């Protein structure tokens, strides 16, 4: 779960950002659904859910974790 | 209207979660768009909008309703 | 000229705007959300963190301390 | 599998059409993914696969069944 | 309806191609769904339906029109 | 381009099937757009294009290549 997510983050995470309870992950062109999917599958306790577009993922942080702390965690697995 | 919505939540709502102003609903694979659409057509005053993925819907709550209160409402409709 | 294209497309495709918290919620005609959302990305506004589109609706994430209501009124006035 | 499919065709199938090995199914807005996935889970021997947009499903007929034969089959099931 | 389709093909159609009863239209990424919807709404007599990816559209030709024929016609509307 | 596609098919391709000028490829849920962009970026001479659903890809074969031939080729690259 977590090791698959980690590898794919290393492959596919271009950048991260945050606002409030939200991390925003940028990926290459066809890649966001695929990444989002590995995140969901990892089922992180600090994560409520994810929604992907083509090249963007919204990851919803579980309180009290913030979007910034979620995004920092994702950075440090890449 | 709200009728179809309540009937679909009965059939399709697997689980709820929340964070901040967001309710995150989970459905069977391939059902999230269809349920999201029903929730839009109901046009509930406490919902601003929804975004569906394949089995996840992010519901944005209208202030002052929280994601938790929103999740609590979808869950008691079935 | 990313902003001008965004401005042109808001004029054409934006049906309604709304908000909650750090989120602006934009509505478009069916099939148009993804196209407008990418024009908004392309424009790289200082106060926008990112966007996610469905079929007819866009979530636009405001950069703190800009709020979703602020982003919404700004999109609204570009219509 | 096939009960669920046939029930959903009853609710959601608005119209059919065909060309060659292809059946085109129309649904109400937001209904096509849900219907498409019911069809997939039913695993019909005459179906090769499906792709859904918002209100349109492309069903690929297994040779020698035509798109017209596949479309006629889907209609008589409503 | 057809005018909007014509105007959009002029802005969004990058290239055209075909195979059998199929026209394949290419767009910029993020623009396929929007174009397909405009094609759909124009309801051309020789088009059975469309399905959009991200930057590609499958247009289904109504027999006896071919994909090459459709693609020619779309091509000359740019 | 082709080497990346070849790596991805080994990881993501679950089954191949076909009908007429179409190869139908199945991946795990959430992997189809990712594999489909890699197929596109390989630009194979015999492929007109691809459209991805959630776990299904339609690959359009270039006349006179058939979908069965494309499918058998993709199958042997796992």
From Swiss-Prot, chains A, B, D, E, F:
Localization: Cytoplasm
Major subcellular site: cytoplasm
Any one GO molecular-function label of the UniProt entry: DNA-binding transcription factor activity
Keywords from the named record: Amino-acid biosynthesis, Arginine biosynthesis, Cytoplasm, DNA-binding, Repressor, Transcription, Transcription regulation
Cellular compartments per GO CC: cytoplasm; transcription regulator complex
GO biological process assignments: L-arginine biosynthetic process; protein complex oligomerization; regulation of arginine biosynthetic process; regulation of arginine metabolic process
Family in the record: Belongs to the ArgR family.
Function: Regulates arginine biosynthesis genes.
Protein's name according to its UniProt entry: Arginine repressor
Upper taxonomic lineage: Bacteria, Bacillati, Actinomycetota, Actinomycetes, Mycobacteriales
From-to range in the entire protein, with total length: 93 to 170 of 170
